[PDB]
């Protein structure tokens, strides 16, 4: 009676909330998703009731980008920080001058990445560069660095073809890589400005009062799927229990 849409396969966590589910009479089933454009739109058209796969900044641009979508975090799940790869050098203060970099080109992701690169010493943005920032806001590159912008899901099979790689957490685990050990540098999660990057579950703005959903999260967040969430990705997230006004000011924050 209720379909989840996950776009990782970190779902162990899930897996858990399922079999625990039965005992309350609720039938819990796992939708997978091959990217990140197309959990909103199957949320948004009642093919799934929720959805665990993005963080605050990726939906508020999303919504920017469809005025006639309702949706709304009704909890929150991992902070998953965001990771630097490369398969030829593993000192990210020693990358080489004209190196080919790569980035996910959705918005938030690739302010994101950007502000990553930066965090490195890689290039240097404007000083007020925002949740939005994109490619031209760059004010230096030293090491004249070829940056490109490729879809989320595809910075980690670019690796190959590249020096280095900002690769979403999800991704790089989807690619068989550990997020925690494998990154040549990692993002900051122990602050503020990490917040926007929490992952959620998200529903429709109708049902953020649902009583069958509140049982989903709190099932999600009970001690047993919690232990199974650490076991599953291990020190790769960290998981994120915000109160429900935590989630509204993170969200208003944001718009």
Do not use: C
């Amino acid at each position: 009676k209720v379909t989840i849409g996950v776009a990782s396969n970190d779902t162990k966590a899930w897996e858990k909330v399922k079999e625990l589910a039965k005992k309350d009479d609720i039938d819990v089933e796992i939708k997978h998703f091959s990217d990140y454009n197309l959990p909103n739109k199957a949320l948004n058209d009642g093919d799934i009731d929720m959805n665990a796969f993005q963080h605050f900044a990726f939906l508020d641009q999303y919504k920017k980008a469809h005025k006639g979508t309702k949706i709304s975090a009704l909890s929150t799940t991992v902070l998953a920080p965001l990771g630097i790869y490369s398969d030829k050098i593993k000192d990210v203060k020693k990358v080489k001058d004209g190196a080919k970099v790569v980035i996910p080109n959705d918005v938030s992701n690739q302010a994101r990445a950007l502000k990553l690169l930066e965090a490195a010493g890689l290039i240097k943005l404007k000083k007020d560069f925002g949740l939005a920032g994109t490619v031209k806001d760059i004010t230096s590159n030293p090491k004249h660095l070829k940056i490109t912008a490729v879809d989320a899901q595809q910075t980690a099979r670019a690796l190959s073809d590249v020096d280095i790689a900002v690769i979403n957490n999800g991704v790089a685990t989807k690619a068989g890589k550990d997020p925690k050990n494998d990154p040549i540098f990692l993002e900051k999660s122990n602050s503020d400005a990490v917040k926007p990057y929490i992952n959620i579950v998200a529903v429709n703005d109708k049902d953020l009062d649902n009583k069958t959903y509140a049982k989903i999260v709190e099932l999600y967040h009970s001690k047993e799927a919690q232990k199974a969430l650490q076991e599953d990705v291990k020190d790769g997230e960290k998981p994120v229990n915000l109160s429900k006004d935590e989630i509204k000011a993170i969200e208003t924050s944001l718009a």
